[PDB]
Structure formats: C-alpha cells, structure tokens
C-alpha cells in the first residue's frame, strides 16, 4: 500500500461516486485531502471530508462552485495558505433529438469545470517537481476510440477529458509534473446500487436483472488506482496516458475491497459486445 | 471536376477563410450554397456573391450560430426554400505561448464555446433535413488530422481542446448518420494562404513566395481553394460513405481524388510538418507539393 503521509491532495467533485472513494483511499494512504462540491449540510462534501479522516487521513471540505472562477481561485489560495503545496489534483437519442439546452449545459459542467480548475490550481502544483494531475473520465482511449458513448454531448465531454490529460502532460513535464486521464470500470456507486434495489452487501442479487453487472467494481477500486499513482516515484512513466482502474490493478497489484481485480473494458469488448453470455471468469 | 448541379449546400461560417473558399468551390461545381456568418454589409454577402459568379448560387443568411433561435430559423428557411439539404459544412470558429494557468481564462472559455457549441447547435437544427433522405454529407472543419493531433500539442489548452473536439464530432456524427445513409467526416486544410495570412506576411496571392525569406516553411502553404476542392470531391463522390467517420486532410484527398490547387500543385502539409520541419531539416518543398 502507498504511504502518502505528508502529501496534500485535492479532489474536485468529491461529494459522491469516484471522487469520494478517491478522496477516501487517499486519506487511507495517509494524505490530507481537500474535497470540493456544492452540496453542503450523509450525502455531502462534509460527509466526504469526515470519511477521509475516519479512513486515517485528514479531509478538509471546501464547498466550491467549480463554474465560478473566483470560488476556485479562493480554493487555490486556501491550499497555498494552509499547506503551501499541492501534490495531487483530481478533477438512445440523436444529436438532433436530444434536448439542446441540457446538452450544452452538460458540456459546460463536464469540460469548463476542469479547465477552470487547472487554470487556478496548477500554479501551486508545478511550484515543485513531482506533482500529479488525474483527470477522471468514462472509458479509455483505446475503448472510446472505437465506440460511440451514449450521446453526442456525453461523448464529447468524456473524450475532451481524455485529451485534457494529454494536453496537461505536455504542459507539466518541464515542471516535473505528471498528468493522466483515468477511468473506473462499471462502478457499484451509491446511485447505481439504489437503482438496482440492492446494497453493497448483497449486490449480486441484481445479476438476475443485469447479468453483465457481474464485472462491476466498488468505487474504492479506482480510489486505490489513484493512490498507487500518487505513491509511485516513477509515476512519470504514465505521463499523457489514458489508464483504467483495472489496468492499474494489474500493474500495481492492488485489489478491490473484495480482493478481486475487475477488468471492465476488456470484458465489455471480449464478452459483452462479442455476444457471449455474462461470465466473469478470467476478468476479475 | 465534380458536377454538383442540383445539390443544396450550407456552409456555416463562410465569410472568410476555408468556409468562404469551400462555398465558392461548391458553387463552381454548380451548387446552391447557403452561407452564414455574422458579418454583414469581407462579408457573408460578398461570399454569396462570389458563389454565384463562380457558376453557382450563393444565398447569404446572417446567423449567430451561438443563438439557437437563429439557427432554427436558418434550418426552416432551407426546408422552405429547397426542402432538402445535401451537404453541410461546419467551419464556425471564434495565446500560442502560454500554459493553461497563464492563458486568459475568460477568453479561453469563450474560445471553447464559440468553437464547440456552435457546431453542436448547428447539428441539432440542420441534421433533420439532411437525414430526411440518404446521401447527405456533413463536413466538420478542423485544424489538424487525428494522426497529427494525436501526437502533437496544438498551440494552447483551449485551442487544442476545441480542434480535437471537432475531430470527435465527425466520428460521433458518423454513428448517428449511418442508419440514414448519411456520411460525416472531419476535414482539415493545410497551411492556408488565407486573406489574414497573406496580409500578416505583407504579400498578395500573386506574389506570395516573397514571404519565404521571413517564413521559409511557408513553402508548403496552400490557397484556401485547395480545401474547397477537397469538400467538392467528397460531395461529388457517389461512394463518399467509404470515408464515414474518418479524419481527412486537403492534401490526402488531393492524392485520393486527383484535384490540384489553383496553381496545379498538391501540397501535403501534414507530412511535410513531421518529415521536414519537425525533423530539423531545412525548408524544401521537394516531394511535398
């Protein structure tokens, strides 16, 4: 397990989902984790901060509207003020049938938030060599390169975030910084679980409803992937790359909480898209 | 030369640059071209007038492509006047030395909205008429090919994201159009001798090589009409669907279709940049145009 004691991390959008689990596993590795989000006081950013500390780290919730630049500027001044450093930064319809106002808003919320974040927080990170940026997305470059993702606006956002890691990787290298774009697999998120009417303790009950859900992973999986990167002294070998939680589980050797290693994106192509029946053998 | 007589085309953002040159070469191939832009009476009307003299029909529709109501009215007009849309070209566009945190943020966000949102609004309102019948063609204009951009950082954070988003737009639209018999590609010009480029170097088109002393690698440049002839070759290709979803360049299509620039050459900008300029070799167009 990575020893991240003394490290300063910030997870933008950590109220729920991968962001919370990422912040929590960073705290479990011993880091101080700034966690941001709009929903305040549990399904709150404060609850996220409390989970980071409970895990053995220090979680500091900073409520932020990441589309409001002055709020992200204030966020960046705060980490500098309190810490003086930042080691890890974590960020059915045709196009003409889709609702246009929603699609444009989706692209602004999914892309502009990352750009505003990098503009204000990257100066502190490149202040010393060794900083790491992880841009979170849905899918790998290899998968998204040959697959349309759900909708026009969704697809554009997720592939923009893929490019953001390549772009930042070129901008950060002269400072000794690293940027990657990371995706989870099929997450057993709090939202996903309630949608299937199950708890984490009894998640395979849903396999009758969704048989291919047998490849799913807990949110802590991609959280341990980030911790492995932030603890990697030669993490710069990944600079500019698109990576997945399952790919990094094979490289670093961590497991999900249940000890398995789901490999979602190979399963989707070789089994599910291949017309084969749901069968996790050899994929977790 | 392609015979596009009877074809109805629309070029979004056709006041100048590739968009004007594309609209003109479509009219020279016989098309009726709707040309849009904000700049009216170096105007969109001038673009329409140039389409007509070239042997076609240019119809200027001043449009703010960031205002959906205006783009919807534009789409209703083509249906009202023509009832069909065969070719749609998207060329709507809005700090080369700066990091994302050094760049001006408000400008960068405005750059991404003007360069990405305008294309999405355009596809939302105009694609229904285009997919009404098979054989429609969508051309999303960009800077660079997927092969080049995949291994090259492009100018700035915001610029890079915009141009690579439009590349993805061609792939995405290719999936949405296939059941309708429609085709989408993303096309880039080379280094265009645009009106802006020519004035920046203090030259005219008639004497453009005078600039080689100050910019030697400009020897690979092309006139705007080159990429215009690439669009016309696609729109005239009965088997254009073989390109569906692909990223293409003006020089690559010159090799495939056999057209030339106005001066009879075939600049291959993106191979030249990698094999000569980025390789440290001196500027020498031999074998690249």
Author numbering:
A (entry chain A): 9 to 49, 58 to 107, 119 to 311
B (entry chain D): 9 to 49, 59 to 111, 117 to 311
From the manuscript:
As a family of DNA damaging genotoxins, THIQ antibiotics exhibit remarkably potent DNA alkylating activity through the departure of hydroxy group in hemiaminal moiety followed by an attack of N-2 of guanine in GC-rich region. Here we discover a self-defense strategy featuring with reductive inactivation of hemiaminal pharmacophore by short-chain dehydrogenases/reductases (SDRs) NapW and homW, which are integrated with the naphthyridinomycin biosynthetic pathway. These results strongly demonstrate that NapW and homW functionally catalyze the reductive inactivation of the highly reactive iminium species, which implied that the two SDR proteins may participate in self-protection from endogenous DNA alkylation. Collectively, these results unambiguously supported our proposal that the SDRs NapW and homW axiomatically endow cells resistance to NDM for self-protection.
The structure of NapW contains a typical Rossmann fold with seven β sheets embraced by α helices, which is the key feature of SDR family proteins for binding cofactors. The binding of cofactor NADP+ enables loop 47–58 and loop 107–119, which are too flexible to observe in apo-NapW structure, adopt stable conformation and are clearly observed.
